[PDB]
Design a protein around this ligand. Structure first.
Ligand code: HEM
Ligand code: HEM
Ligand code: A1BUF
Ligand code: A1BUF
Ligand code: H4B
Ligand code: H4B
Ligand code: CA
Ligand code: CA
Ligand code: CL
Ligand code: CL
Ligand code: GD
Ligand code: GD
Ligand code: ZN
Lengths: 403, 402
């Protein structure tokens, strides 16, 4: 049998038949569940993955079992036998990147998974050309505030040659300077990469919102430093619709969330450099990036300016300040005409995705703990939706830091 | 093989060695995680009974002793004579506390050592059931200074029926279905409201009509008992600065007293064992009053707050919820009824995790239920990795008696 899955707001019940096809294994066993852990973790095996991928492709275009389907299978079979690897067709790479997004269990934004611009950078041959490809990505995806989802795919891993890597975890990151107390000026999430940036010749700053340079790695080659042109990096100054002093906090965030440190895996090929980007959900900025105690940690500062009683928890000063910070983020992005989505609309759209995917594939891999937003969880519909978490391929995967 | 568990705020690391002693199997496999699902022989009885007796004696440091061997031989002879056995009253107290301490979805477990255990195993008939319950409610409420308590009715045994409390809680508001199709009252209790009506009770017409009690002696049909209104402490809800909030007519009850779960100790099963604590404010203010399938008052409150409800990005839902939770905390404190806010409760759970790490090498915890339903990441438990597994003694869900 297949896991029965229930929505408790509405009473509806589905069965996730797709989960039976989970190839790779997660961290849970019948004896104990580890679903809350942040990081859970041969021509023959390559071929069954490639085969399965090719089968997925030909199903998506409703030409399963066709002459072209059998010929492509045979072609991949013969190329793996001759060379130990194979090359994707362009249309397969596009389909593969969209499937990896569609399969990501921790992404609430997957209603968009079919609108993804895929830049083929598989002919890239240097760190310098890499930088050109990334700048075109940022330009296209920013679109002067009307943000567009995109992925740029650099050459696949292959034996006898080092990987392309982007060392930065995102294309746009703020510097995090280790003050000597152990404190930090700027973003503490970025202390390691900031120091590697300086270790490699970047002249630092001392502001809180200093955009980091990119550390780009060509095969068998130390990383090279590249400064982003300031007009390529769209930023939003934060202000609050009614709390005028808020603007004096001097807060900013960048428009484009572009993750650059994950591995794209398609039919057994691995792409260690394939940055992808969408647009922000406001709670990522307002609640996590600004209010996490180990990020910018502004919550007490705002609550005091709001004149709340911060000496007892029962006044809910924390909740009130966080709500207003999230209001500032939404108001500020809308005022700047930069795409943003709030957690209520985002989770509503995700519920539509679950319904589409149940029809299309008989299920959807989803990580409840990551889909429910970090404030107001039970106020969104995903809170009341049971979910099944499992790993399908194509996939985006975490990978070791290249240093 | 022992799971590594990290706190990402502090960066600290522990290993949960207790998860190795997981007696039952949960719903997850290497292929798929089902952690977010709400509802996941004499030789068999003996091995469970022996495991619990071994547990108890190791916990009182006098194990492998004469009293330890004496007790093991007694339970073996009991089950051979009768098919079951009797818990010594101290074993029953220890087993009830362990079942609380082992409950993965309870954020209030810092209090697990402080539990009043009322032994009602000498109970027969539903009228005595009702008197035990009323003594529980009276003791647990304590004029607003709430005290944790459990009352244990006779265990299931072969051939004989069971004591059951058909109500999911001792205090529940009626849910009346309408011609409109809507429910007046609590939608959660539509089923038990119509059971109470069928078994005699003449219904009210209010949004907060306290239900009667449907208590079932073994084999006999259930009997309808009214609760003395002076026993059922309630809190009218007002807000410290929104003067109109009082006029919404909202209220809630003091005692969270769950009466439909089954207590399992040493292979023994107590299908009636109501237990109560005190409320975390988010259970009332967020879940009970704001869930779309409960009272669903969010938009009513936002309209009175003159919020812009035609767009989500105003966060009118978030603002109304926070103020509804303020009103709960204010109303309970002003009424001198015990209540804990979600910040205080998650801070204490973090302490409980640290105590349990030293006490026995870990703690089963259900992250999705420990993290509060508003302001999740503002609480320290959001950043704490957790391991969920089943230990015995335990509280378990059980099928409806009907
Ligand atoms: C278009 C709008 C999008 C929105 C609103 C969105 C939203 C989100 C959010 C809120 C998260 C959780 C992040 C966190 O908690 O730090 C997430 C994770 C993720 N997103 Fe999306 N996303 C979007 C587009 C995309 C695109 C275009 C891709 C790839 C093509 C993608 C792939 C992923 C993946 C793989 C994760 C999980 C990574 C991990 O395991 O940590 N998303 N997304
Ligand atoms: C003393 C103050 C207590 C507080 C603040 C507290 C808090 C909570 C909360 C917030 C939940 C989640 C329930 C929900 O979301 O509906 C819960 C569940 C639970 N509590 Fe506690 N609790 C307390 C006392 C107790 C006591 C005395 C017992 C038993 C003797 C107990 C056993 C349980 C169990 C078994 C569950 C989970 C039931 C299930 O699996 O659904 N708690 N508690
Ligand atoms: C594509 C996309 C859009 C968005 N709006 N947000 C994202 C957030 C993440 C993320 C960041 C940091 C971490 C590390 N905690 C985990 C993530 O999933 C991501 F990869 C992709 C995102
Ligand atoms: C003992 C105790 C204290 C408290 N403050 N709250 C509780 C809440 C519950 C609960 C209610 C309803 C449901 C059904 N959704 C699940 C529960 O865990 C419980 F059993 C015991 C509680
Ligand atoms: C420990 C816990 O699982 C961890 O902090 C997770 C929980 N859920 C999350 N959900 C999202 N979307 N993003 C996160 O970073 C996290 N963190
Ligand atoms: C499907 C999901 O597990 C379900 O809605 C859970 C989530 N977390 C919860 N957490 C608590 N404390 N109480 C609940 O009822 C729930 N519901
Ligand atoms: Ca070729
Ligand atoms: Ca009609
Ligand atoms: Cl981010
Ligand atoms: Cl409740
Ligand atoms: Gd103002
Ligand atoms: Gd008015
Ligand atoms: Zn699991």
């Amino acid at each position: 049998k297949f896991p029965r899955v229930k929505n408790w707001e509405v009473g509806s019940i589905t069965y996730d038949t797709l989960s039976a096809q989970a190839q790779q294994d997660g961290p849970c066993t019948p004896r104990r569940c580890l679903g809350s852990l942040v990081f859970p973790r041969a021509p023959e095996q390559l071929l069954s993955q490639a085969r399965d991928f090719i089968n997925q492709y030909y199903s998506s275009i409703k030409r399963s079992g066709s002459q072209a389907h059998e010929q492509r299978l045979q072609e991949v079979e013969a190329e793996v036998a001759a060379t130990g690897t194979y090359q994707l067709r362009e249309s397969e790479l596009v389909f593969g990147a969209k499937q990896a997004w569609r399969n990501a269990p921790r992404c609430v934004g997957r209603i968009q998974w079919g609108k993804l611009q895929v830049f083929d950078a598989r002919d890239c041959r240097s760190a310098q050309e890499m930088f050109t490809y990334i700048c075109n990505h940022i330009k296209y995806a920013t679109n002067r505030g009307n943000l567009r989802s995109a992925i740029t795919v650099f050459p696949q891993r292959c034996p006898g040659r080092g990987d392309f890597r982007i060392w930065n975890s995102q294309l746009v990151r703020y510097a995090g300077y280790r003050q000597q107390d152990g404190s930090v000026r700027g973003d503490p999430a970025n202390v390691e990469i900031t120091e590697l940036c300086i270790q490699h010749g970047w002249t630092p700053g001392n502001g809180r919102f200093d955009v980091l340079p990119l550390l780009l790695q060509a095969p068998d080659e130390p990383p090279e430093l590249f400064l982003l042109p300031p007009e390529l990096v769209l930023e939003v100054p934060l202000e609050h619709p009614t709390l005028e002093w808020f603007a004096a906090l001097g807060l900013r965030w960048y428009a484009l969330p572009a993750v650059s440190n994950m591995l794209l895996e398609i039919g057994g090929l691995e792409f260690p450099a394939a940055p992808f980007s969408g647009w922000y959900m406001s709670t990522e900025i307002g609640t996590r990036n600004l209010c996490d105690p180990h990020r910018y940690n502004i919550l007490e500062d705002v609550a005091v300016c709001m004149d709340l009683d911060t000496r007892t928890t029962s006044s809910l000063w924390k909740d009130k300040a966080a709500v207003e910070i999230n209001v500032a983020v939404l108001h500020s992005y809308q005022l700047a005409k930069v795409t943003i989505v709030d957690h209520h609309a985002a989770t509503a759209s995700f519920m539509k995705h679950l319904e589409n995917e149940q029809k299309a594939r008989g299920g959807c891999p989803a990580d409840w703990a990551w889909i429910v937003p970090p404030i107001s969880g039970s106020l969104t519909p995903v809170f009341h939706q049971e979910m099944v978490n499992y790993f399908l391929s194509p996939a985006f995967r975490y990978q070791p830091d290249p240093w």
